[PDB]
Automatic annotation (TrEMBL), chain A:
Keyword Ribonucleoprotein: yes
Range of residues in the leader sequence: none
GO biological process, one term: translation
Transmembrane segments: none
Superkingdom, natural source: Bacteria
Designated name of the protein: Small ribosomal subunit protein uS11
Functional note: Located on the platform of the 30S subunit, it bridges several disparate RNA helices of the 16S rRNA. Forms part of the Shine-Dalgarno cleft in the 70S ribosome.
HAMAP family per the UniProt record, alphabetical: Ribosomal_uS11
From TrEMBL, chain C:
Organism this protein belongs to: Enterococcus faecalis
GO MF term (any one): structural constituent of ribosome
PANTHER family from the UniProt entry: LARGE RIBOSOMAL SUBUNIT PROTEIN UL2M, RIBOSOMAL PROTEIN L2
Region described as Disordered: spans on this chain: 33-54, 220-275
Protein name: Large ribosomal subunit protein uL2
From TrEMBL, chain D:
Keywords: Ribonucleoprotein, Ribosomal protein, RNA-binding, rRNA-binding
One annotated GO biological process: translation
Gene3D superfamilies cross-referenced by the UniProt entry: 3.30.70.60
PANTHER family: MITOCHONDRIAL 28S RIBOSOMAL PROTEIN S6 (PTHR21011), SMALL RIBOSOMAL SUBUNIT PROTEIN BS6M (PTHR21011:SF1)
Pfam assignment, any one: Ribosomal_S6
Stored SUPFAM superfamilies: Ribosomal protein S6
GO cellular component: a single term: ribosome
CDD domains with a match to the protein in the record: bS6
Stated role: Binds together with bS18 to 16S ribosomal RNA.
Protein name per UniProt: Small ribosomal subunit protein bS6
Molecular function via GO: small ribosomal subunit rRNA binding; structural constituent of ribosome
TrEMBL record, chain E:
Gene from which this protein is expressed: rpsO
Quaternary structure (record): Part of the 30S ribosomal subunit. Forms a bridge to the 50S subunit in the 70S ribosome, contacting the 23S rRNA.
Superkingdom: Bacteria
UniProt protein name: Small ribosomal subunit protein uS15
GO cellular component terms, semicolon-separated: cytosolic small ribosomal subunit
Length: 117, 66, 275, 97, 88
RNA sequence: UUUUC
RNA sequence: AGUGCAGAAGAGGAGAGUGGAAUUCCAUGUGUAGCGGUGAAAUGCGUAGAUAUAUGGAGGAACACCAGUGGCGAAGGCGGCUCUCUGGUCUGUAACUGACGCUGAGGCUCGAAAGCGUGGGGAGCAAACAGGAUUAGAUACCCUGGUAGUCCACGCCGUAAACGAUGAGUGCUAAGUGUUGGAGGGUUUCCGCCCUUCAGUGCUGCAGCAAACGCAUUAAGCACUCCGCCUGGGGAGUAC
């Protein structure tokens, strides 16, 4: 609807999941997808392939409401966060600027018990 | 032997000279190290405290993402 | 500070009391005293309403400001005294017009200071401003509820408040006990926090010292015969056989919020935190 | 001796210029009362801000320069009054050598 | 602690002749007024330790100079303890 | 970076 | 050994105020079936709208880069910024005091973390405890929760692998090479080389030691002064 024609998407990729959501120029949420949302499980959400198919399934609903260009927000230091961008380029978008913002603190809090496995 | 900036005989760092100050920061906004810029030890410290004063009054940004 | 009496007899083992070091003099004026009765909690009809009262020493009024309307006239402070009424220490004030009355004395008052009370007076300890002119983040007392009464909020010892944020109307204020309240902006206040800090740091020690203060012994509920109190009766010691322990009039003791709902202030109250 | 000072504060953009002169004279009077030899005062720039501060992204920069004995309270009467205003955002006091 | 103004002041009245910046009368006098000002510092900032150590070292040094001065010339010893107010 | 020798 | 005169450096200490980023909670817009988690799952949270996402509001703690075999302190330890009080160190000079020194049984002071008393505060973190997993069993490792405590003030206890496992004071004995702060000679725009000289701080090495290991001008080498300590392993730093 309304031919929004621009906006910013979001990428967030853990060591066990990656999730994409596409917004307006501010933006309100338009449509989102996840590696688990496409019917996957557990370990296999860490692959770059699931990131590809989830990002493309988000774009399919995203450009059924009027959308050509997008900027890319990346949180979540992980693995498939590049394949998300590059398959986001694949099925018909015009990515023009990428900002990878994952914020560093300035040593304010403590991490948890440093694991013993 | 790497050329420090103190070839000019400037004693007090003047606290606001942005021409004398942007050389030591990153394009993103951090501090460049002393081996990178190649200066003496005390001038590293003087520039450190100078821009730590300069970061509070809005004369220089903390973080440059947006 | 606090005295610790050496244990000489067994009703003196664990006594404490103050030094009364802040107090300069011991002589009140004639012009500000007014008499008082005891009541021992008895009505016009002459029956006990609030239990456990009466039976102690003698007391008098000391007429104390709550308004501070004489503005744009400086004022010298000379003494720091009692009330037996209030917990809190209280100060005489000489207006330069030649008018005397007392003032609630906060922390940090010294003899010889001058307290100004206009709508644009300076901001130190002891001044009296309307709540519009007070900037963000001070410590405040004698807050008027409604403009023209005089103070009714935070008065007693060692207490405080703050200013969270103005609006056009009203002014927000953090009270004690956590709360946040909307309060009209044409109300008076003071700046500072009250004097004695230490009334929770005093053993009373004897029975007689808390009996000097106008108290009276309070019987346990479960000791009464079953016809003066619903916990009573029972042969031997008994637990509370009734669900939800009760005051002697009905009204279970641990759990009822008794704010009425249809109160006329729920638009103004935000976050009753500890009641 | 004394100690040399920069005292640089940030003024709002949306005030009027007569209020600027009244503000400057007010703080110069609260310096000159408490035993403070004023020496020199200039206005620095009309500069914007490298990040937003209260809701503002511009500011008017002034600098006053003063020496005083360290026992005198010629500075604390500035410190109490500057940060309780509406128009002075921040202010910094450095030893100048 | 002190300024050079009083440091210039008190060396001159207690010097035995011109230029007595040694001369252990002058040294125990300067140490006396130093430990008085630092004792006021200790009364002010009652939980410093890193200057109270300096108090202890100055009192030890003045103690040792006074105990030296006793072993040579007892008349100047009585002169100074009347003159500076110490020794209890 | 699953227990066992 | 000191003190005056002239300079230099520094996360040495106490008091007071202030800054930015981040995690959590609250409020509101968008948004709907998942989120989080692991070697693998599951407890847990989500249709009473979660995660995500944008704007502000709250509050406590720690201070990214600078940052280094750097520096400071007798040791414990000390890194956002500013101001007030304040200790110690090093370099030139030797006009001033004329041996005023060292070590120090008992005594006094300081002393990481954990713990105790009273009053505050409580964002993360997490002994005790609860639930989910693995195992033959698992009161544990892994996961989800979660208090006392960790912070502030004023008192208490006086302990460690408090270690360089190397007590303090002083003199003597080949060199080589980096660094922190100084001070002199000349080339000299030297402020950007080199030569000489004080201190701390690394590393490789000779006589000499040592059971080898290794130490070696910052000796575990050559010698004097003073103090503490040891005499097979257990019983035990226990009993009285």
């Amino acid at each position: 609807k309304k031919n929004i024609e621009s906006g910013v998407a979001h990428i967030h990729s853990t060591f066990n999941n990656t999730i994409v959501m596409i917004t307006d120029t501010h933006g309100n949420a338009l449509a989102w997808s996840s590696a688990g949302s496409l019917g996957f499980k557990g370990s296999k959400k860490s692959t770059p392939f699931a990131a590809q198919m989830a990002a493309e399934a988000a774009t399919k609903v995203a450009m059924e409401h009027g959308l050509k260009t997008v900027d890319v927000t990346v949180k979540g230091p992980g693995s498939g966060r590049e394949a998300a961008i590059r398959s986001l380029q694949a099925t018909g978008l015009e990515v023009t600027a990428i900002r990878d913002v994952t914020p560093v603190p300035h040593n304010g809090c403590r991490p948890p018990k440093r694991r013993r496995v | 032997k790497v050329d420090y900036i103190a070839a000019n005989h400037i004693e007090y760092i003047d606290y606001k000279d942005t021409e004398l100050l942007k050389r030591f920061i990153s394009e993103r906004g951090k501090i460049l190290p002393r081996r990178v810029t190649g200066t003496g030890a005390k001038n590293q410290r003087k520039l450190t405290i100078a821009i730590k004063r300069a970061r509070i009054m809005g004369l220089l940004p903390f973080v440059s993402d947006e | 500070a606090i005295k610790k009496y050496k244990p000489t007899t067994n009703g003196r083992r664990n006594m404490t009391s103050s030094d009364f070091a802040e107090i300069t003099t011991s002589t009140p004026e004639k012009s500000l005293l007014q008499p008082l009765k005891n009541n021992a909690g008895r009505n016009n009809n002459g029956r006990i309403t609030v239990r456990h009262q009466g039976g102690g020493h003698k007391r008098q009024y000391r007429v104390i400001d709550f308004k501070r309307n004489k503005d744009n006239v400086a004022a010298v402070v000379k003494t720091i005294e009692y009330d037996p009424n209030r917990s809190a220490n209280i100060a005489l004030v000489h207006y330069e017009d030649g008018v005397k009355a007392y003032i609630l004395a906060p922390k940090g008052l010294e003899v010889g200071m001058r307290l100004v009370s206009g709508p644009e007076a300076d901001i130190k300890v002891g001044n009296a401003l309307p709540l519009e002119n007070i900037p963000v983040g001070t410590v405040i007392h004698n807050i008027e509820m409604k403009p023209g009464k005089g103070g009714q909020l935070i008065r007693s010892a060692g207490t405080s408040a703050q200013v969270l944020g103005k609006e056009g109307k009203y002014v927000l204020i953090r009270l004690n006990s956590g709360e946040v309240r909307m309060i009209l902006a044409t109300c008076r206040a003071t700046i500072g926090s009250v004097g004695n800090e230490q009334h929770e740091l005093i053993n009373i020690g004897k029975a007689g010292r808390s009996r000097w203060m106008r108290k009276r012994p309070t019987v346990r509920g479960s000791v009464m015969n079953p016809n003066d109190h619903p916990h009573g009766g029972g042969e031997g010691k008994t637990p509370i056989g009734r669900k939800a322990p009760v005051s002697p009039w009905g009204q279970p003791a641990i759990g009822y919020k008794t704010r009425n709902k249809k109160a006329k202030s729920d638009k103004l109250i935000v976050r009753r935190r500890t009641k | 001796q004394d100690t040399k000072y920069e005292i640089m504060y940030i003024i709002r953009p949306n005030i009027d210029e007569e209020a600027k002169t009244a503000l400057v004279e007010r703080f110069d009077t609260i310096l000159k009362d408490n035993g403070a030899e004023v020496i020199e005062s200039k206005d620095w720039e009309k500069r914007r801000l490298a990040y937003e501060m209260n809701g503002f992204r511009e500011g008017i920069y002034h600098i006053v320069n003063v020496t005083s004995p360290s026992t005198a309270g010629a500075i604390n009467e500035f410190d109490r009054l500057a940060k309780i205003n509406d128009d002075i955002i921040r202010h910094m006091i450095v030893k100048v050598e | 602690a002190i300024s050079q103004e009083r440091k210039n002041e008190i060396i001159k009245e207690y010097a035995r002749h011109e230029g007595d910046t040694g001369s252990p009368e002058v040294q125990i006098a300067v140490l006396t007024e130093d430990i008085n000002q630092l004792n006021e510092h200790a009364r002010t900032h009652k939980k410093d330790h890193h200057s109270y150590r300096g108090l202890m070292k100055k009192i030890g040094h003045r103690r040792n100079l006074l105990a030296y001065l006793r072993k040579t010339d007892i008349q100047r010893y009585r002169e100074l303890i009347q003159r500076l107010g110490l020794r209890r």
